[PDB]
Design a protein around this ligand. Structure first.
Ligand SMILES: C[N+](C)(C)CCO
Ligand SMILES: [Ca+2]
Ligand SMILES: [Mg+2]
Length: 343
């Protein structure tokens, strides 16, 4: 399946506009899952201007079922595909799918410091979040907030690993997550707009946002119903994490890079213009986002341990950083009297 002759054979069989070509007409380039650009070679492309000349060929990661329900992932994707939110579905094959090729660049860490970019991301997220009240999403879909489901599932998965202390205070964090979850079942019941349940992406970060000749969202693996502030929290956290480091550990974290308050207000203002602003409301949303960040750290800390056991990026050292970020955020929130009856 990493065999380019086979990737070609599948594309010729599954992409109707390409069924007459042979593998001599096709180019394969490799670009947690496996992605290949598949495309018509230059001279072939030049004779076929009326059709797609590229596809994203996607081979499903071998252990993603430990993270999410595979059947649901696809159902959710087809819907985001039909609504033109996600990359268009071209076809499936045994072990993956073929998608529309997006022409554009993922955003980089430094784009998130640009207020104009921040806005367009806010504009896009705001309009995205109205989907559940403006279109009728399948009624059989689970409305339970994904924060709750992802946390329980990922915490429970950690039990499968026995030598887990060797990667240290994991049982403390596990306990800490039970505290977050208990606190959030109370917290989330107040009237705060930041508690509205909407259909969330659940993994916003610059590399899941593509800049085309407009900003598009991608990678809806984790997408599902969640507290709206959850979606904003991940994005805000991600302003301080750079994944482009090209040597061990392949990441950098800089607290000082965390999106300024000035830029956070700007973002929510732009967000609400598309989602729906009282200054009190902006600050109540910003508070909920800071409360949700607490749970984001535990969640992605657990996710990253699970990934480290799957693979063999230093997932374990990244897990360690996110769990440290939980400690810093907890101490920020408690010592500023923002959360109470947590411990
Ligand atoms: C955003 N993380 C890198 C923490 C994992 C999701 O792809
Ligand atoms: Ca980031
Ligand atoms: Mg992605």
């Amino acid at each position: 399946l990493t065999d380019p002759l086979y990737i070609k054979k599948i594309c010729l069989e599954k992409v109707p506009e390409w069924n007459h070509f042979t593998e001599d007409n096709l180019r394969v380039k490799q670009i947690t899952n496996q992605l290949f650009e598949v495309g018509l070679k230059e001279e072939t492309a030049n004779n076929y201007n009326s059709i797609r000349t590229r596809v994203l060929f996607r081979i499903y990661g071998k252990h993603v079922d430990e993270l999410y329900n595979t059947i649901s992932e696809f159902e959710v994707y087809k819907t985001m595909s039909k609504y033109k939110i996600a990359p268009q579905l071209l076809n499936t094959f045994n072990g993956g799918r073929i998608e529309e090729w997006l022409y554009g660049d993922p955003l980089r860490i430094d784009d998130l410091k640009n207020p104009t970019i921040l806005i367009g991301i806010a504009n896009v997220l705001g309009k995205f979040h109205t989907l559940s009240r403006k279109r009728h999403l399948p009624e059989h879909w689970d409305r339970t907030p994904c924060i709750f489901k992802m946390m329980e599932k990922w915490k429970n998965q950690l039990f499968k690993y026995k030598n887990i202390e060797k990667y240290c205070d994991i049982h403390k964090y596990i306990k800490e997550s039970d505290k977050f979850i208990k606190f959030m079942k109370v917290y989330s019941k107040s009237d705060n707009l930041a508690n509205t349940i909407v259909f969330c992406h659940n993994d916003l970060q610059e590399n899941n946002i593509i800049n085309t000749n407009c900003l598009r969202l991608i990678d809806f693996e984790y997408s599902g119903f969640n507290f709206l502030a959850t979606d904003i929290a991940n994005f805000f956290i991600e302003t301080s994490i750079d994944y482009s480091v090209s040597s061990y550990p392949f990441f950098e974290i800089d607290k000082k890079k965390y999106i300024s308050y000035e830029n956070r207000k700007l973002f929510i203002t732009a967000y609400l213009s598309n989602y729906l602003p009282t200054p009190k409301l902006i600050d109540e949303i910003l508070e909920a986002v800071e409360v949700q960040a607490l749970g984001a750290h535990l969640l992605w800390g657990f996710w990253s341990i699970i990934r480290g056991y799957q693979t063999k990026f230093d997932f374990f050292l990244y897990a360690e950083q996110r769990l440290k970020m939980y400690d810093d955020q907890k101490e920020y929130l408690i010592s500023n009297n923002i959360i109470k009856g947590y411990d």
